[PDB]
Amino acid sequence: ALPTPHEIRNHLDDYVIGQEQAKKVLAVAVYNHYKRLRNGDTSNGVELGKSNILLIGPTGSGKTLLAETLARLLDVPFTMADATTLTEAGYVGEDVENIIQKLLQKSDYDVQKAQRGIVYIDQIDKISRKSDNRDVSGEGVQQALLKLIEGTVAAVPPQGEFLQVDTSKILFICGGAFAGLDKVISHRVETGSGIGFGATVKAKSDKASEGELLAQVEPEDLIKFGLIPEFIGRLPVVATLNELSEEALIQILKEPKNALTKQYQALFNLEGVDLEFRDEALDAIAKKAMARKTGARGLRSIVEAALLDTMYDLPSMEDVEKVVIDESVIDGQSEPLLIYG
Amino acid sequence: LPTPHEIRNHLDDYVIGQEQAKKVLAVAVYNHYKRLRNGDTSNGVELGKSNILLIGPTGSGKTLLAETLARLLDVPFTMADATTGEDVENIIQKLLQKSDYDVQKAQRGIVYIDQIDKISRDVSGEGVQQALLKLIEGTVAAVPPQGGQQEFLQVDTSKILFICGGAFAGLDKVISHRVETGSGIGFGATVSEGELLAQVEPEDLIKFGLIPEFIGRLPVVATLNELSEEALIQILKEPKNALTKQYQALFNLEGVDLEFRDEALDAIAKKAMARKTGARGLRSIVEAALLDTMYDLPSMEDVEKVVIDESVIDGQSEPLLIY
Ligand SMILES: Nc1ncnc2c1ncn2[C@@H]1O[C@H](COP(=O)(O)OP(=O)(O)OP(O)(O)=S)[C@@H](O)[C@H]1O
Numbered sequence: 001a002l003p004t005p006h007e008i009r010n011h012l013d014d015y016v017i018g019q020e021q022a023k024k025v026l027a028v029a030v031y032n033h034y035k036r037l038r039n040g041d042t043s044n045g046v047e048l049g050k051s052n053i054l055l056i057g058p059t060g061s062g063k064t065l066l067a068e069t070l071a072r073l074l075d076v077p078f079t080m081a082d083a084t085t086l087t088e089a090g091y092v093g094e095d096v097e098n099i100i101q102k103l104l105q106k107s108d109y110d111v112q113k114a115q116r117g118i119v120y121i122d123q124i125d126k127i128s129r130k131s132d133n134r135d136v137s138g139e140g141v142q143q144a145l146l147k148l149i150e151g152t153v154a155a156v157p158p159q160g161e162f163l164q165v166d167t168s169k170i171l172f173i174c175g176g177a178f179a180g181l182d183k184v185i186s187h188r189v190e191t192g193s194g195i196g197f198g199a200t201v202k203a204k205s206d207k208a209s210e211g212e213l214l215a216q217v218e219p220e221d222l223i224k225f226g227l228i229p230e231f232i233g234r235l236p237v238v239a240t241l242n243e244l245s246e247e248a249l250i251q252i253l254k255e256p257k258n259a260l261t262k263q264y265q266a267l268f269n270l271e272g273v274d275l276e277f278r279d280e281a282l283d284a285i286a287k288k289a290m291a292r293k294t295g296a297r298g299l300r301s302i303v304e305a306a307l308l309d310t311m312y313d314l315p316s317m318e319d320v321e322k323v324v325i326d327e328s329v330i331d332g333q334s335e336p337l338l339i340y341g
Numbered sequence: 342l343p344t345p346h347e348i349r350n351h352l353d354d355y356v357i358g359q360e361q362a363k364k365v366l367a368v369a370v371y372n373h374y375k376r377l378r379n380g381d382t383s384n385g386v387e388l389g390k391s392n393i394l395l396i397g398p399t400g401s402g403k404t405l406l407a408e409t410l411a412r413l414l415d416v417p418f419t420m421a422d423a424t425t426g427e428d429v430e431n432i433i434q435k436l437l438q439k440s441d442y443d444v445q446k447a448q449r450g451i452v453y454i455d456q457i458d459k460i461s462r463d464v465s466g467e468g469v470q471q472a473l474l475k476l477i478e479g480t481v482a483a484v485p486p487q488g489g490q491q492e493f494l495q496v497d498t499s500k501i502l503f504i505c506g507g508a509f510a511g512l513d514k515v516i517s518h519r520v521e522t523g524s525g526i527g528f529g530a531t532v533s534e535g536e537l538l539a540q541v542e543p544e545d546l547i548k549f550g551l552i553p554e555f556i557g558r559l560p561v562v563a564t565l566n567e568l569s570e571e572a573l574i575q576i577l578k579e580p581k582n583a584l585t586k587q588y589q590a591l592f593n594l595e596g597v598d599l600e601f602r603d604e605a606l607d608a609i610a611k612k613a614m615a616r617k618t619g620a621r622g623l624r625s626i627v628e629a630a631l632l633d634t635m636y637d638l639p640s641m642e643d644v645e646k647v648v649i650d651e652s653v654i655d656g657q658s659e660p661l662l663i664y
């Protein structure tokens with residue numbers, strides 16, 4: 001009884017911010033995974049639906065973060081693979097069995113402990129079907145993962161005969177960033193616009209928001225993207241993430257220990273100078289961040305773009321003990337204040 | 342070994358509201374396997390195969406009839422898609438995986454296709470119908486056994502039955518003017534669709550976009566017109582693998598009781614029909630509702646029963662709890 005859905009959401013809140021709905025979904029699926037394996041196929045209900053996860057969100061939304069923060073809190077091992085280096089037919093790039101090999105290294109070759117492990121994959125969009133231009137990075141890779149997800153056994157050389165390791169009990173988290181998916185959903189939901197007086201006048205973009213647009217997604221929508229329907233059928237769960245809120249970004253710069261403010265703060269403390277960031281400058285940065293349409297990953301651009309001149313002349317400058325950054329410095333047409341003595 | 346009456350009852354256990362479709366597949370599959378038990382040894386040499394064509398809305402149980410039938414009959418079965426230049430070899434090797442790469446056992450298997458109307462009106466559009474013609478008549482395709490020998494196994498395609506599933510859009514207008522009446526625009530002229538589909542003929546399919554050569558190979562026709570609102574409730578109650586029974590069984594091991602009143606199930610029918618997706622878009626309504634309850638249920642203690650009301654589906658109210 002180690003995992004608690006009410007507690008697992010509290011722990012992720014410490015390392016992740018801005019995604020409340022997605023955290024609830026993972027707690028249910030994760031709890032249902034071990035609840036099932038506690039009594040495997042012994043209940044009266046036969047043909048129980050398999051529990052998997054499908055993370056869908058924009059860039060910098062925290063998809064990769066949930067996979068890492070979850071493994072730290074969790075006891076069973078965790079792996080972080082990628083679909084970009086995967087090939088088929090034993091080519092020079094990589095094989096699907098490598099994911100099972102890396103799992104044992106984390107578990108020290110414990111099959112009983114490895115079957116209860118977690119799996120995570122990034123950049124699932126790369127394996128999306130494409131028209132013929134041979135195409136090895138595509139449908140072929142999906143077939144290997146499909147038979148692997150549906151439950152089977154794969155030969156694994158122990159320590160480098162082969163060992164059989166069932167996979168119907170192992171969890172899989174296929175997650176990545178889908179590009180152009182919003183356009184596909186728009187065609188289905190928009191259904192045109194009226195032109196007369198009584199018609200619903202449309203502005204430039206009243207629905208171009210991942211939130212309220214991805215929640216209405218369906219499995220058939222992903223088929224047009226390139227994925228196989230049978231592959232999606234094995235993942236009934238879906239997790240829709242929204243673009244980070246401007247207020248949420250502020251919290252990322254203050255509460256997390258790895259905040260960019262704390263990073264540059266220590267960067268100048270070793271140099272013998274203090275640093276400060278007022279609240280009026282944080283919200284201003286959030287306005288510029290959303291305009292870039294990159295997420296928290298593209299937040300560092302606004303910071304270094306401002307402190308470029310300051311850092312250039314700080315080592316040469318002497319007798320400077322503290323630096324204060326005003327809101328005008330971020331908007332422009334101003335210079336950060338410097339403290340001497 | 343089975344009979345049309347015996348197989349009808351088994352199908353009834355997992356499927357409901359489609360009576361005519363059961364008799365079609367029963368006699369078809371019965372006579373289909375009869376040819377395998379006795380081939381050209383009889384006077385009737387070269388017994389031809391009779392393909393099957395399913396027509397119904399989306400989420401109308403088209404896939405379940407093929408999937409459930411496969412479980413009942415101890416033979417392999419795969420699922421194909423009209424989306425996948427020819428790209429027809431993937432369907433053969435996909436079947437050998439379940440059959441453990443067997444020639445004779447696979448040859449008696451069945452295959453299902455979805456969205457067959459998506460190609461009717463280019464190598465991915467009308468070019469697919471032309472290619473299938475030989476596949477639905479008989480041929481052999483190279484399939485690497487085990488992936489690799491430098492050899493390939495031959496697997497005929499005359500013994501493998503095909504079921505082209507899909508949902509035709511706008512077909513009702515074509516048959517109305519041809520058979521029932523030419524109307525819809527005039528004053529006196531008349532402005533469920535199921536009854537019309539029963540009177541369907543291949544001539545109407547030609548105007549839809551299909552090729553006559555393609556339709557000739559599928560003389561059998563099935564009409565999965567619609568699913569009733571009560572049937573949806575029955576779908577969650579009569580089948581042993583219903584989702585309502587799954588969640589009930591999920592909490593049985595937890596030591597908590599579950600309930601689902603009839604006043605709450607009818608609301609699910611409205612949301613299903615509102616999405617125009619059928620039974621496929623059902624878990625989204627249930628899982629989205631019980632997400633809150635499941636999230637805090639383990640944390641909560643001294644709770645032996647849970648009741649879900651109609652308001653709970655909307656989300657305005659909270660599911661009643663029992664201590
Ligand atoms: N919810 C979040 N809360 C706080 N910081 C976040 C959040 N999401 C992203 N970040 C920041 O962005 C960095 C990268 O997070 P990722 O999980 O990689 O974002 P991502 O959208 O998952 O990237 P991809 O495209 O999935 S690889 C983290 O190290 C944080 O600094």
Ligand SMILES: Nc1ncnc2c1ncn2[C@@H]1O[C@H](COP(=O)(O)OP(=O)(O)O)[C@@H](O)[C@H]1O
Nearest residue numbers: 355356357399400401402403404405576620621
């Ligand atoms: N008559 C029915 N009885 C029981 N379940 C049904 C029925 N019709 C549809 N379903 C449900 O729908 C799902 C399959 O939908 P499917 O046939 O794949 O939709 P589509 O035909 O649009 O692909 C199954 O999980 C099944 O339980």
